[PDB]
Ligand SMILES: O=c1ccn([C@H]2C[C@H](O)[C@@H](CO)O2)c(=O)[nH]1
């Protein structure tokens with residue numbers, strides 16, 4: 175995608191040399207914002223082949239308030255294995271904060287139902303937020319939230335959403351981060367009888383790993399392809415009743431996939 | 439300031455008509471980012487006269503973990519009167535979350551000391567965040583946090599900071615929001631022996647009230663003046679030991695102040 179290749183280029187020309195946790199060197203910039211008008215197509219990178227099936231499964235897993243790996247494993251989605259303990263537990267990461275934020279007095283707040291309530295009954299609210307940055311629970315999480323905080327906005331029959339991402343690996347993680355969130359904007363929109371608007375991605379430490387340089391140059395050689403179309407085959411009775419087979423990507427013709435290794 | 443006048447213009451040309459809580463109409467945009475290099479001068483708007491003395495006093499008040507109005511009143515700073523109850527209490531707003539975030543198990547987390555610890559002993563961290571969006575305490579706050587979440591970043595001996603602001607009144611509140619945060623970047627920098635870098639302002643619902651149109655047009659007529667210089671007369675022994683008289687703004691020559699009324 176144009177916005178994405180322009181950001182890859184920006185990190186190459188402007189990033190400062192910064193190191194990652196006792197390991198790999200990175201080219202790094204701080205503070206960046208991109209906008210995707212979801213009416214123009216689904217923001218799935220076409221300059222390299224991306225597999226959406228793990229993305230869908232992880233999102234549906236988050237929506238259930240699930241913090242254990244078992245569901246992902248029944249579907250052979252293995253992207254959280256690296257962090258999970260011996261019982262498949264990741265600690266109170268994303269879905270637990272989304273669905274059951276714990277208060278000092280013993281309550282558990284369902285931020286996802288609050289947001290749908292606000293979108294239906296108070297759409298002009300400037301407070302339609304869900305946050306995963308729970309300070310009191312960060313020491314028990316396998317990893318602190320990267321996509322930490324997001325806000326919905328309604329204007330002119332259209333749902334927009336801005337994500338704050340504290341930390342971003344531009345090559346491996348970001349195409350996945352964008353498709354994940356654009357999919358949720360479409361599910362929320364369908365549930366509230368709204369049209370989709372914009373996904374605004376805002377990042378903090380936005381970077382490229384030094385051993386991914388040959389791959390980023392290979393990708394920047396490539397011209398972007400027409401963006402694909404997401405079709406949802408069914409309107410579920412609530413946001414928590416979606417199934418993997420409800421989603422289809424139509425018109426997706428990427429360039430070949432590129433492998434990105436990581437140090438250990 | 440150039441960036442600020444370009445944003446005022448953007449809300450005029452691009453904002454959609456959106457209404458505020460059962461009241462005034464606004465011109466509204468969603469998703470905006472601006473960068474201020476603090477080496478180029480202190481980002482205090484010169485196209486209208488702004489009074490910094492309440493800004494300093496409110497920031498020092500936040501740093502003490504103070505949620506009651508008394509301190510502001512001893513100095514005749516009256517900007518929080520509107521929200522305070524009969525005893526001067528505002529509920530667990532900003533300073534209480536900054537200094538004593540309450541956990542489900544009875545602890546109180548000092549996010550400001552954590553951030554200084556990280557800046558001194560782990561400066562490359564992608565997790566140097568303080569958040570005021572405490573979901574479990576939002577129903578007891580006088581108003582939910584507008585400047586909700588911010589992240590520090592260190593690269594090349596320089597401290598940068600990005601603020602996420604959920605909601606912003608461009609005319610009355612934003613010049614105040616920027617100077618408040620730019621001042622804290624300078625205090626944190628002084629305490630960590632770092633130089634100042636950039637203040638990145640990111641906003642959610644960024645707007646202009648309909649009864650402020652004559653004033654925004656008057657301000658856009660004006661050419662920006664050279665930005666002022668902030669001098670700190672003393673290095674305190676910690677971030678919690680600053681005093682009002684430690685700060686001086688040098689070289690500030692604004693255009694006359696403009697009044698902005700509000701509906702009730
Ligand atoms: O949603 C995510 C999660 C992690 N990362 C990156 C951040 C950093 O590069 C590394 C942290 O484990 O992986 C992302 O890009 N996106």
Ligand SMILES: O=c1ccn([C@H]2C[C@H](O)[C@@H](CO)O2)c(=O)[nH]1
Pocket residue numbers: 584585605606607608610611612615
């Ligand atoms: O730091 C702040 C606090 C409030 N507001 C605005 C948001 C909205 O316009 C109104 C909410 O009371 O005041 C700001 O611009 N900045």
